[PDB]
Structure formats: structure tokens, C-alpha cells
Design a protein around this nucleic acid. Structure first.
Lengths: 171, 126, 732
RNA sequence: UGUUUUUUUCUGUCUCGUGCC
């Protein structure tokens, strides 16, 4: 789920960057350092909205590099277990379904899916229907799910969905 | 132990600020509008594009005033912050569906008290 | 067990996957579906005509469903029931059409069942803008309309509701009819009321409440899809024009970048020209593509008049405005987007078809077995001297002298080359020593650049001047492009034949095999192995599954036309594993037969070896009777199957004028004399043979008479082409 | 209508005595 929290970070600036654009250079470096990354503490970060302030640059002894402990006001996306969101199905396979929760991709197996949704390998587009063929679920459809698990593959979140609770499909 | 169903989160995340799909959508749209201008700038990455096309398919309302009103009419209640995003984003039809999806609502409030809120949310949709 | 010990052949089972056989009533439906879906956009099977083509397709489908017939088995064995040699893609096309008809029928049945269930549910609910279950019958009947039928079904589901417990403007049908006919027969809601009054009877206080409902009804209407379908897909002058970034990124490499201002490309350029479709798809992938018909601006204007009121005085004007708004809403919802999606799907299908056709043409051109045997037919075959040198610059060039029986006899190296800056004798001496070491039958030299060609020419000149071809005659070293031998040298067969050998020896062996029996090398490779050879750049854009299927069908047809030697795949590894692309003898069946032959040690005694030894089933034997060949009965190593053995013997006796007494082996004048050469052809009449087949046999022999006569006169006929010598451009 | 080479920081033990600012 997307959130707006206040984070902090420090970046060493090489002395060649000193000059009238010092603050601009620090901001530019901050933008291209904490956008799109991920961490196991705060989760996946989308982008930065604004910066609070620039700390006092403490020049290191015997080294020209100076660090600026900046505190930026950026957004973050850290999904938790039990949350329910609305994603879009990307691909349908007999092994399982694939979706895309924004910057993360989950996966639901046939076991999680009830027995009513069978396979349609004969038809060209992989899809799942029922005996009466009333409800139809395919790709590019806003289908909900439940985040029953979480995982971080070295700054690459990959949760797992489920389809056991009622009211999970076309709105 | 971290399960949002039972309303438990780490200490750092407890003091977070919730965001709605439309809110993040307009924030990213404005960021894109600002970044596209001012030439000689590093263009957006695939992450921004995927997030944009992901939040654009769930924008229940484009008007910012709609977001303001739906957050104002909701914050007056006694629900936690976590209940402000999922319920405002999914927009269930009946109170039964909302109670089923979110187990926290089971026994927290009456039936009509939640049905009226859901009807108001549905009407607020464009 | 089910693949090898099954009642029906492997090919027949694989072809009719979605449709497990064809019923008597379903044969006509499948034939109609195949004929309707045989050539819609391009001209294909227009050869066989419309009604004749449909009848032939139906006969082929019926034969496949009844006798478990296959592609080649029905194209050759059923030349009368199907197009008699109308085209190569006869059996495969018929199988595809039958599968498509069966799939369409199954989908229509499912849709009809769903519509009936929905109608019953609606009657149960509301029977205790209505919801009537009348469109289920139409959807079930719409078998040909696949995409349109699906759209209509989805629209019905979204309109009625789809829930499964356990007066605003013109009507949808009237609007659809008025749009399809081009004349607005029904106008909007001709009433004094306007959007102000209609927006108060839902609780929104907005005049756009009914517009959304009208748009949803128009988009989710099969009539609208049918009317829009084919209007732009039939013709769409796609204007190719690079963008600001595509002009420099494409560099005139794709379809949307080659023409800076070359627009107005109709559907013929994309569908017929698969290259244009592939280029558009590639350009539209990352940078951008210029795909716009630009013909609506006038197709969307005519619809505007229809469905709208003509008068304007409040009630009439309000109704006309509401109708216009609803039409605009429906168009924005599923009007332009639906047409664009349909055009994109059609373009992708055309590009895939063009890629598949190019791959099939390349496979047919490169798969024809055209070896260079002795005299272009002492000992069987010729000793191909595979010379696959590396550089020809003082490095060891592989030069293997393989025999004509699908095996390598010997080889050698030639490290000395013209290494030494000025040495015009060491290479000649090495070539002379290599030629004197063995007695090859032909020279098969490779080539990589000008130096390789010069080295090959020098070797050929040395061999011809000193009579190094056979030690007692000049042998012409036939040029061989380093295309198949290089790939075959580093294959599974090359590794198994020689493990402790350098790559030069493997390349020489592959080159020698490629110029002795291309069919053996093609059948003894994985088909992976075929996919290595690129048929065309446009095939990459299209799905490779279609190309692989076309290549497999072409290989199967070539194997059936040329036949398979039973003894060749018993002890010789080079000519083994050739029972994978036979008509009715699938890969599992061929592997099982090979294993049985290796275990029991059974030889190709006759055509009934697999029917008498209990190795192959009756359906398998019947479908693969025209493809299995043996070395020795008399009509075993030919296309004559057991059913036509008596007819062939009788025809041979009549043509040779010999005695008639249970001739299967004993009379050889009619068999051996006719096999040696044509004895008497006027004795055997086509009308008499056909009459005999019809009276006794239960089948006309008008088309099969020629095939039977050819089999009796020539056994084990090869369908491969001749030896193609490299040309100037081809050599380069 | 041609022209032969590419591998690199090693490393040593514990004890006693003598001389020098």
C-alpha cells in the first residue's frame, strides 16, 4: 500500500561539484539514488515528492568528500500480509495466474482457485470459465486478490496472492 | 506476525500517512508534468511508467476536491488509518462485501451505519 | 502405450486433438467451416473451386475421422476424395479446417448452454429494459462468428447482469439495424421530454446518466460488432510515418521508418506483404509505429445522422441531442478502440501468415533431397570426399572420404597450405598424397571467403590434372556450400559417430552426408535441429509454432513421397530414425517399431511385417501402408499396400500378357519383366481398372491406377530433387 | 598475388652477545 513518510539519507559529494549549483547538485544526486530502489525495512520506494532540508556538510578528515545528511519527504509502497488490493491479470497459465500489483508481481495457483474455474487450453487465449460459462476471467481484467504472503528478493518484492475468499473478481 | 487483518504493523509504519489511488495517481502525474519540462534532465524510468499505468486503471475520481471530501467525511469516524485506504479504494457495493473482505469491520460497526457510508462512497464516484 | 499401441495412428490422433474424430453429421459442418475459413483475406484454394473444394475437404475430413487418415495418407491415398494434387498443403489444411470447425461447434454449444441457463434463471427470478433469453439461440447458431460471437456473449452477460445466486433514446436492435443498412430507420426517443426530465426520474442531477447506459448497450451489442467488423479490417490505408525519435532510431530499418512520408499503405501491403507487417510490429514495439487507416474522417459521419431525431423544437431537438450524445459516448467507449484493436489483430495475423508461408517455402526449397551420386542416379552409391577445411592458411583442413551408404569410410588432414608466405608446392604435394591415400568417388569442398574458394579451386585443379579423383581417372570435386555440413558436424549424430575427432572431421562428415542423402540427415535430426536454420527474418515476428508445424508437415510429406527404407534403418546409424515423419507412423510409433526390430531382430520381410509380427496395429498399418518400404514381397518396397496388391498383380499380368494363377511371387515375368522396364502399357486400361475396382474392391481406381502402375514399374521412388551445383550468386 | 610467439612479488622461525648516539 502506498504511503507518505519522512526518510533520511546521506550522500557524499565530490569536491568537483562545489560551486554556485551545490544545492542543486545535491538534490540531483538525491533524486537518482533513492528512486525505484527497495529495502527490507521501509519497503519499495516509488519516487520523491519534496525535500525537507539540507544538513550541514561535515567535511571528512583527510578526504575531500563531504556528506550531507538530507531528510527527504518521499512516498513508499510496502504491502503487508492480509491486505486486499485490486490488480490486473497479466497472463493465464495452467501452472498458475500472474498479476501485477504496481511495482510488484504476485502469483496464484490453481489450488487456491476454486474447482469451478476450469482450464480452457483448447481456446487460443488462455482463460478460465465455469460449467455454465457465465463468469469469464482473462488477462487485462481488474481482478482483486489477497496478499497472504510477502517476500523481498534482494530489493525486489514478490508477494503471493490467493483466491479463496468470496467477492474476488469482476466488480 | 505482520498481518494487516489484525491491525498490527511495525512502529515506524504505524506513524505513516495513508494514500489513495487517485491521490498517488495525481501526485505522479504532476511529477511527470514537472519532469517532462526543464530540458536536459534524466527521463523517467520503467518503474514510474508501470506505476502510472497501474494507478490510472483504478482512478475512481479525477477531481482533487472529491479526494478531499471523501477523506474529510471519513476521518470524522473512529476507524484507524489503515481502514481509510482499502475501503476508499475498493468501493464495495454492500456492507456485507466490505465486512467479508476486511475482517476488522466484523462487529466494529452496525450494518446500516456502514451501508450508508458505502452508498455515499459509490455516489461520490464519477 | 497409447501413442504406439493405439487403435488410430499417431498423426491422426495429433491432428484431431480438439475434435476426437468426425461424426457423419459433423463432417458436413467441419467441411463448411473449413471452406468458409479457407481463404478469407488472401486467395487460397480458390486448384479446388468453392463447391468442389468444400466437397473435397469434407471427404478428407470424413476419411480422417473414419479410417484415422492423416495429411499425406489422405492426400495420396485419397486423391479422389480430396483435391487430386491440387496443392501441397492439402492434408494439413484439411486437418486445420476440421479442427477449427470442431472448436467453433464446441464453443457455440457452450454459448447456447450458457444462454439457456441464463434465460432459465431470468425466467425463474423475474417470473415470480427487461431480461429476455432470446440471444442465447443466436449466439449458439453463430458458429462462424467467433470474435463477434464472443463480443455478443460478453455484451449480453454485461447487459443482463451475469449474477449467479445459485426508455432512453433508440432501442439497441433498431440502432444496429439502421447502422448496418446505412439508413436510420429508427430515430431517437421522439417524445417531448428532454435530458432535464430524464435526469430526475437516476439520483444524480446530471444529464449524462442515460448516455453511459446507451454507450454500454451500443458497445455490448453483437450487431454493432458485426457492422464495424470488416468495415476497416477489409481496407485500411495504414500511413507509415516515423516520429521525431523513430526517424533517427529506425534508420529506415522498419516499416515505420523506411518511408519518411510514404503513407497510404492499404491492407494488401500488410497482409500479403508479411515483411511490412513484421516491420510495423518491430517499430511499434519500442520507438513507435505509423499505423492509421485515416478513412473514418467519411465513415463515422454517416452513423451520426442515424438514430437521431430530425426535428428540433424542444422535444425533437432534445431527442436528437440525446441521441447524438449517446452515439458519441458509445463510439468513444467501443467505437474507435474496437476498430483499432480489430485492425491490429488482423495485421498481426497477416504478418504471422506471411512469416509462416515464407518459412514453408524455405523448408520446401531446402528440404528437397538432391544428392550428387555417381552418374546422377562399382558399388552402391559414390564415395563422397567431404573436404571441410578451416582456413586453408597453413592449418589442418578436414577431408573425409565417406561412402555412399550413409557412412564415413576414412579421412585425413592437410596442415600444409599455400603457414608459408611463398609455398606453391607443399599444398599440391599434400593434396596429391591425400588423393593417392584413398579412392573417393567425388570431392565435396567447402568455402568461407576468397581464400577458401581459391584453395578449393587449386585442390580441384590438382586433382583433375593428376587424376586424383580415383587414382585412375579425373574426378570433378563438386562445390558444396558450408551451410548444412557445418551444422551437422556439431550435432548429436556427428558427436556419436566420432567423439575423439577435431571439428574439421565432423564438418567434412556432415558435408559428405549432406551431398549423399539429405533425407537421411533431415530425418535423423531433432524437430530444435530444424529451428536452427532461419527461413526468413519475418518469421521471428510471427509465432514460431506455425513455422514449426509447417516444417514438420513438409518433412512428413517429403518422407511419404520419397518413402522410407526398412533395412536402411535397421543396422546403419546414418539412415536410422527415419520413421518419425511418416504418414500415420508417428515418432512414438516409429521408436517402438525400431526398438521391437532391434530386440526381436525382425527384418523388413514385406509390407505386412508389422501386421504379421504384431508390432503395429491395423489402423497404423493401413495409414502407413504407402510409406513403409522394404528391401525385398515384390510390392513391399513401394506405395502398393496390401489392399491394392491383388490389383497391382492383375494389372501387371494383363500388361505383360502372362498367365494368371495366384500371382504374388511365383510368376515373375509380369512382376520382374514390368519392374525392369515398361512391358505393355496399352493392355492396362483406366476404364477397365476403374470398373474392376468399383465392382470388386468398394472403390474407384481412376486416380489410384496411375500410382499403382508406377509402383509396380518403379519401386522405392525418391521424391527428392536433383543435385544442384553451386552457381555464381549461389556459390557466393 | 602473401606476412609464425604474451608467463611474473616473492620471504624463513626463536634465542644470545657485541658496538654506537
Amino acid at each position: 500500500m502506498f504511503y507518505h513518510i519522512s526518510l533520511e539519507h546521506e550522500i557524499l559529494l565530490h569536491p568537483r561539484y562545489f560551486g554556485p549549483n551545490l544545492l542543486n547538485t545535491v538534490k540531483q544526486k538525491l533524486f537518482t539514488e533513492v528512486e525505484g530502489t527497495c529495502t527490507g525495512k521501509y519497503g519499495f520506494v516509488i519516487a520523491v515528492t519534496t525535500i525537507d532540508n539540507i544538513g550541514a556538510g561535515v567535511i571528512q578528515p583527510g578526504r575531500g568528500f563531504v556528506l550531507y545528511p538530507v531528510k527527504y519527504k518521499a512516498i513508499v509502497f510496502r504491502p503487508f500480509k492480509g491486505e486486499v488490493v485490486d490488480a490486473v491479470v497479466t497472463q493465464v497459465n495452467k501452472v498458475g495466474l500472474f498479476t501485477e500489483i504496481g511495482p510488484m508481481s504476485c502469483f496464484i495457483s490453481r489450488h487456491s482457485i476454486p474447482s469451478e474455474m476450469e482450464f480452457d487450453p483448447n481456446s487460443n487465449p488462455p482463460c478460465y470459465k465455469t460449467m455454465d460459462e457465465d463468469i469469464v476471467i482473462q488477462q487485462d481484467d481488474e481482478i482483486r486478490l489477497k496478499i497472504v504472503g510477502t517476500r523481498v528478493d534482494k530489493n525486489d518484492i514478490f508477494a503471493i496472492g490467493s483466491l479463496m475468499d468470496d467477492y474476488l473478481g469482476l466488480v | 506476525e505482520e498481518d494487516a487483518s489484525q491491525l498490527i504493523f511495525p512502529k515506524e509504519f504505524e506513524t505513516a500517512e495513508t494514500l489513495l489511488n487517485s491521490e498517488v495517481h495525481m501526485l505522479l502525474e504532476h511529477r511527470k508534468q514537472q519532469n517532462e519540462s526543464a530540458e536536459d534532465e534524466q527521463e523517467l524510468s520503467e518503474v514510474f511508467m508501470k506505476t502510472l499505468n497501474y494507478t490510472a486503471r483504478f482512478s475512481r475520481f479525477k477531481n482533487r476536491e472529491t479526494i478531499a471530501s471523501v477523506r474529510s467525511l471519513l476521518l470524522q469516524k473512529k476507524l484507524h488509518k489503515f481502514e481509510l485506504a482499502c475501503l476508499a479504494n475498493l468501493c464495495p457495493e454492500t456492507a456485507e462485501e466490505s465486512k467479508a473482505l476486511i475482517p476488522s469491520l466484523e462487529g466494529r460497526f452496525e450494518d446500516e451505519e456502514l451501508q450508508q457510508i458505502l452508498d455515499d462512497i459509490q455516489t461520490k464516484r464519477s | 502405450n497409447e501413442i504406439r499401441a493405439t487403435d488410430l495412428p499417431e498423426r491422426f490422433q495429433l491432428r484431431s486433438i480438439p475434435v476426437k474424430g468426425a461424426e457423419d453429421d459433423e463432417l458436413e459442418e467441419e467441411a463448411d467451416w473449413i471452406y468458409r475459413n479457407a481463404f478469407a483475406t488472401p486467395t487460397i484454394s480458390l486448384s479446388r473451386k468453392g463447391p468442389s473444394t468444400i466437397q473435397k475437404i469434407k471427404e478428407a475430413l470424413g476419411f480422417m475421422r473414419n479410417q484415422h487418415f492423416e495429411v499425406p495418407f489422405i492426400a495420396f491415398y485419397r486423391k479422389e476424395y480430396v483435391e487430386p494434387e491440387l496443392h501441397i498443403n492439402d492434408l494439413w489444411r484439411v486437418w486445420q479446417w476440421d479442427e477449427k470447425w470442431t472448436q467453433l461447434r464446441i464453443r457455440k454449444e457452450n454459448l447456447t448452454r450458457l444462454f439457456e441457463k441464463m434465460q432459465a434463471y431470468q425466467y425463474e427470478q423475474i417470473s415470480a429494459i427487461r431480461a429476455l433469453d432470446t440471444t442465447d439461440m443466436e449466439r449458439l447458431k453463430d458458429v462462424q462468428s467467433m470474435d463477434e460471437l464472443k463480443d455478443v456473449y460478453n455484451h449480453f452477460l454485461l447487459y443482463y447482469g451475469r449474477d449467479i445466486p445459485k426508455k432512453f433514446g433508440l432501442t439497441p436492435e433498431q440502432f444496429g439495424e439502421n447502422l448496418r443498412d446505412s439508413y436510420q430507420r429508427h430515430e431517437t426517443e421522439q417524445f417531448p421530454a428532454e435530458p432535464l426530465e430524464l435526469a430526475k426520474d437516476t439520483p444524480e442531477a446530471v444529464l449524462e446518466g442515460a448516455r453511459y447506459m446507451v454507450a454500454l448497450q451500443i458497445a455490448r451489442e453483437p450487431l454493432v460488432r458485426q457492422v464495424l467488423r470488416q468495415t476497416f479490417q477489409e481496407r485500411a490505408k495504414l500511413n507509415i510515418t516515423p516520429t521525431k525519435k523513430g526517424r533517427k532510431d529506425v534508420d529506415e530499418a522498419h516499416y515505420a521508418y523506411s518511408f519518411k512520408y510514404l503513407k497510404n499503405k492499404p491492407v494488401k501491403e500488410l497482409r500479403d506483404d508479411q515483411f511490412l507487417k513484421i516491420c510495423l510490429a518491430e517499430d511499434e514495439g519500442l520507438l513507435t509505429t505509423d499505423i492509421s487507416i485515416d478513412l473514418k474522417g467519411t465513415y463515422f459521419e454517416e452513423i451520426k445522422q442515424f438514430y437521431y431525431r430530425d426535428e428540433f423544437s424542444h422535444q425533437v431537438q432534445e431527442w436528437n441531442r440525446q441521441r447524438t450524445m449517446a452515439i458519441e459516448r458509445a463510439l468513444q467507449q467501443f467505437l474507435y478502440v474496437q476498430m483499432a484493436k480489430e485492425l491490429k489483430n488482423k495485421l498481426l495475423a497477416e504478418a504471422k501468415e506471411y512469416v509462416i508461408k515464407a518459412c514453408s517455402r524455405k523448408l520446401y526449397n531446402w528440404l528437397r533431397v538432391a544428392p550428387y551420386r555417381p552418374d546422377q542416379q562399382q558399388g552402391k552409391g559414390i564415395r563422397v570426399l567431404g573436404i571441410a577445411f578451416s582456413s586453408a592458411r597453413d592449418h589442418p583442413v578436414f577431408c573425409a572420404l565417406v561412402n555412399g551408404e550413409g557412412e564415413v569410410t576414412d579421412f585425413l588432414r592437410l596442415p600444409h597450405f599455400t603457414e608459408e608466405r611463398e609455398k606453391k608446392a607443399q599444398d599440391i604435394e599434400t593434396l596429391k598424397k591425400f588423393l593417392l591415400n584413398k579412392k573417393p568417388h567425388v570431392v565435396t569442398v567447402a568455402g568461407e571467403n576468397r581464400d577458401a574458394q581459391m584453395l578449393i579451386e587449386d585442390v580441384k585443379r590438382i586433382v583433375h590434372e593428376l587424376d586424383q579423383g580415383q587414382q585412375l581417372s579425373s574426378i570433378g570435386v563438386e562445390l558444396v556450400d558450408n551451410e548444412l555440413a557445418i551444422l551437422y558436424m556439431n550435432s548429436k549424430k556427428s558427436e556419436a559417430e566420432f567423439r575423439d575427432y577435431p571439428p574439421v572431421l565432423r564438418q567434412a562428415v556432415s558435408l559428405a552426408r549432406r551431398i549423399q542423402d539429405p533425407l537421411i540427415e533431415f530425418a535423423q535430426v531433432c524437430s530444435e535441429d530444424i529451428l536452427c536454420l532461419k527461413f526468413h527474418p519475418l518469421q521471428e515476428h510471427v509465432v514460431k509454432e506455425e513455422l514449426l508445424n509447417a516444417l514438420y508437415c513438409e518433412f512428413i510429406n517429403r518422407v511419404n513421397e520419397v518413402g522410407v527404407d526398412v533395412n536402411r534403418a535397421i543396422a546403419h546409424p546414418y539412415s536410422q530414425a527415419l520413421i518419425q515423419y511418416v504418414c500415420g507412423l508417428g515418432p512414438r510409433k516409429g521408436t517402438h517399431l525400431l526398438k521391437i526390430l532391434k530386440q526381436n531382430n525382425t527384418r523388413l520381410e514385406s509390407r505386412t511385417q508389422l501386421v504379421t509380427m504384431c508390432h503395429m496395429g491395423p489402423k497404423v498399418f493401413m495409414n502407413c501402408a504407402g510409406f513403409l518400404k522394404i528391401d525385398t514381397e515384390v510390392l513391399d518396397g513401394s506405395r502398393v499396400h496390401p489392399e491394392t496388391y491383388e490389383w497391382a498383380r492383375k494389372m501387371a499380368v494383363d500388361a505383360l500378357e502372362y498367365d494368371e494363377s495366384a500371382e504374388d511371387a511365383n510368376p515373375a515375368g509380369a512382376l520382374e519383366e514390368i519392374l525392369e522396364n515398361p512391358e505393355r502399357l496399352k493392355d492396362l486400361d483406366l476404364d477397365a481398372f476403374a470398373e474392376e475396382l468399383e465392382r470388386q474392391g468398394y472403390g474407384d481406381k481412376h486416380i489410384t491406377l496411375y500410382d499403382i502402375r508406377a509402383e509396380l514399374s518403379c519401386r522405392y521412388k525418391d521424391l527428392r530433387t536433383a543435385y544442384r551445383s553451386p552457381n555464381t550468386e549461389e556459390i557466393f
